[PDB]
Symmetry: D2
Subunit: 262 residues, 4 copies
């Protein structure tokens, strides 16, 4: 707990990266839960296992008789933590749609965001409820150009767009990873201004690469166990360290906006 000498303290935050991830994904799951108003479903299909998809699918098990996660990456089966959730890779779903009858969801949720599922694939369903996650955060022309959320809202008797922002703060996307990074970065900025702090370390890395380039979910989850922030200071900063992090986590606001249509 000392640094280079006993004159300096090293403090690692109690809040871990996985704790921030958990808070964000829980907010998204609760936003969906609120939108669905306790409606029960026979078959839910959720596109996009990483990063919030896993927990969102878990949260649907109560009111959905069957919950299926679909991901173009077969190795993301490893990111599911409950066995009640069925996993299908995109080729398996598309095959089952073409030469089968078992796929006819009354709830469809697209969490894939930028460069994700095609409106054509969504158009193959006729659910009671369709939710599309809007990957756009605050304004960025380049991201707006590549977004096609509105084109994906092409089926369903009830339609919603899942939005996630940080109150009073700028983030480029609504993605769980983006929000976690931005929470940590903003927290570091304020922590560094605490009296006696020498420097403030965000324990960040390109976690996305661990999942999608190394294709190592186990390692990714281990990486999330790290303290979010490590601080070097002369005086104790334990309590303010957690207070600043928790405050920035609390700014995340997730909600489904109903999209009107007949």
């Amino acid at each position: 707990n000392y640094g280079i000498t006993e004159s300096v303290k090293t403090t690692r935050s109690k809040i871990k990266i996985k704790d921030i991830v958990s808070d964000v994904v829980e907010k998204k799951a609760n936003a969906i839960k609120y939108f669905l108003e306790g409606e029960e479903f026979k078959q839910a299909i959720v596109f996009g296992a990483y990063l919030s998809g896993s927990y969102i699918a878990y949260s649907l098990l109560k009111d959905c008789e069957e919950v299926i996660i679909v991901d173009i990456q077969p190795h993301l089966k490893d990111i599911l933590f409950n066995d009640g959730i069925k996993f299908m890779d995109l080729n398996k779903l598309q095959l089952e749609l073409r030469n089968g009858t078992s796929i006819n969801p009354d709830l469809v949720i697209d969490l894939t965001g930028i460069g994700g599922v095609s409106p054509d694939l969504i158009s193959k369903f006729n659910p009671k409820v369709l939710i599309v996650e809007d990957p756009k955060g605050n304004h960025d022309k380049g991201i707006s150009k590549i977004d096609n959320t509105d084109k994906r809202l092409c089926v369903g008797a009830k339609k919603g767009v899942l939005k996630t922002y940080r109150s009073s703060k700028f983030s480029k996307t609504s993605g769980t990873m983006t929000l976690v990074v931005d929470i940590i970065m903003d927290s570091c900025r304020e922590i560094n201004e605490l009296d006696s702090v020498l420097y403030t370390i965000p324990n960040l890395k390109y976690f996305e690469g661990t999942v999608f380039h190394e294709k190592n979910v186990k390692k990714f989850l281990t990486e999330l166990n790290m303290s979010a922030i490590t601080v070097s200071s002369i005086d104790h900063v334990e309590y303010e360290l957690e207070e600043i992090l928790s405050k920035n986590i609390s700014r995340v606001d997730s909600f489904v906006k109903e999209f009107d249509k007949l």
Copy 2:
């Protein structure tokens, strides 16, 4: 070079953490070089091997017949990269001073900063030149309270204080590590505002722990070989990434202020 899909790019900065470290330590070494005005010395003693001390000691070999690094941590002998530099731990030095004649430096440089060498030990020398690195950066009451740089300027015919700041930007200390962290953090914030960037990763960790808690200099040097920043974006940002990092490195200004009398 793609991310989750081919619609998103992943870009790793060409500038590595060690490159930023190198730039900062070079500025400190050059600040000392300028202050010394080409004066030649028989024996230089540098306190504090980590983080700039190693290169600073190297830079003194030209004009100093003997250059000795002293560190309270014996394992920091591993952070010296030239064989021309002699290493002594604090115990070995303090003993050679009491019952020896081999230690009589005409150049003394204290790079230890916060919680470092005592003024009592500095007072045991009588060099031509004394340089003390001021660990204080911009204003912080807690850091000012523990600093005793001025009390260490107690010997030497010529006295100087090595200061390092970032032009127009706030940093809590002049330490190489602090400056590298702050360069990367400020660069990340500006990079994130580039059009089409989704998020911006500073490839940071508690490197100091690797050196002083794990006592693994080799691992530490390996950790520095990492790209400073990794970006997720829709469009190419390769050149802007380097421009922003380079600009923030260039804000570092290191200089020795002469302490009169």
Copy 3:
């Protein structure tokens, strides 16, 4: 460009004036509406909300709209119109002309009033070809989101659009012209202050809104806008970077009308 307290320090006032930033923002909003309207011609356009972009937006409609009427709840805002080609009606005069007469039947309705503005009830009294409602929400804020009712105002019109205005890469709480101008200037000041040799950086800001709505003096308000956005104290020349930073922040404003789909 002059000296400060002594000739060792320079005082630089920006060439860009507050009114120039206002102009650029209101022009972007007007052009967003223009693009949405796709050259359609209209017999009668009614624009709710004269301040701050309404005056110019209404003027920009004159080309394709035979008659353009600005409606504002504040009668003194008649003073904020550019010329006589736009008709001004206070809210009371409109609501009376709606009840007694046939002269009010717009085929284009634009609501620019934003927070606490026109009621969905009043909008529902029209049956235009096109309805545009300005969304006052900027980036995320719970308190502003809670008081906004933009979606409830989109209750008439064969074609419906929502006018949105944000700053690329930067946070603003609303899309209001005033908010955006303030934030442009504030973000510019923070970057200008970091220029080498700057001592301090003054945003030439005040509560301009009060001049319009509390003092009720539009002429004074327009005079207040005819002032350099920023004044800088520095050792060295900063005139060029000063304008470049302001111009860059102005260019981040992005205004567009998002079509609100309604098949029925």
Copy 4:
């Protein structure tokens, strides 16, 4: 508070006025000098630089100094003295009295003129017990460092001190009262804007310095300082947080005299 454009939006003017922030800052500088002087009494104090902290600092010296004189190169700055117990001299009148008369022989000299101010040559004409020079440098800026000559002004006096003023954890380019007031208000505005329900946040700023030095109108300047520092447009009440944020940023100002050995 009052309503804004409609009764759905509120307008809040801060209770803290610009003049209150000025007062707090100049008081901190005066107390820094007070602490440095350790209750020593003086026969004649000369303070160079009436604007902006000089007026109050001179007032604060009346207690322990039999005579207090403010010297300014601008004769109209006699108007910024609020106490008649303080004597005013323009620079010409002083230099003439130094060359011919004998009435000028201060035992306390304080130079508050900072950038482009009094010359070391003029300071060298005195032989006080105590010399204090205000260091105008704030945090690091190369252009400002290059024009500063504070150290060259510390050329007389049995006891020498440098008056420094910084903001804890925050960046300011100078120690000037005006710079600090501006930066306090600007940093407060940034944080206030992030309060829930705030639409926009107005710093009630203008180029006050011009009112004093270009319009040469101290009366108007003092009236200009009698405005709320910040005006906020918001949906919900923010009055409590508005004052707390301003007060917090004021409290970051730290002024102290460093003894020059």
